[PDB]
Each structure stands twice: as C-alpha cells, then as structure tokens.
Write a protein that binds this ligand. Structure first.
Ligand SMILES: [Zn+2]
Ligand SMILES: [Zn+2]
Length: 89
C-alpha cells in the first residue's frame, strides 16, 4: 500500500549539517580573555547577547557549563581585534 504522514518540529537533521560546515574549523573549547578562567564550549544557540562586542549571535555561541558565559564564534577565536593587534616593539 501507500500512505502519508505529517511532520513535527525538533527534527532538524539536514539543517544541523549545514551549520557544522560553517564551524568545521571552529574549536570545541575556546579560551576567551574575559572568561580566561575557563574555556567556553561552542554551544548551539538560536539567539543570545555577546558580552564582549555587545552583539547577538545565531546558531552558534560559546557557552560555559560552569559560569554560563556566552560569546561569539569569531570573538572567541580572536583575542585582540578591537583597536590594536599583535605587534613587537
Ligand atoms: Zn561578540
Ligand atoms: Zn566558566
């Protein structure tokens, strides 16, 4: 025979794969400066508020299961990219 069925939420299988491709190089644990104490853990988040650059990330946010610190994928990756950079002298 042949019959049809309906669909439900919380079943994002393909979608997830997409994001992963974006964070293929992105590390699982980052060592931020403001939270140097511990290394955040890239946690999947729909929306949040970065406590570094004062922005809002999506489908990506460095969360810590110890202090609950959220950050941006890029913000965490980089160290000092606000005004100055790596220079010797
Ligand atoms: Zn940020
Ligand atoms: Zn922490």
């Amino acid at each position: 025979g042949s019959s049809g069925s309906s669909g439900t939420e919380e079943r994002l299988k393909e979608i997830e794969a997409k994001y992963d491709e974006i964070a293929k190089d992105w590390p699982k644990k980052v060592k931020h400066v403001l939270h140097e104490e511990h290394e955040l853990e890239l946690t999947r988040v729909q929306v949040y508020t970065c406590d570094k650059c004062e922005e809002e990330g999506t489908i990506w946010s460095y969360h810590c299961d110890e202090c609950d610190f959220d950050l941006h994928a890029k913000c965490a990756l980089n160290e000092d990219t606000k005004e100055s950079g790596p220079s010797s002298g």
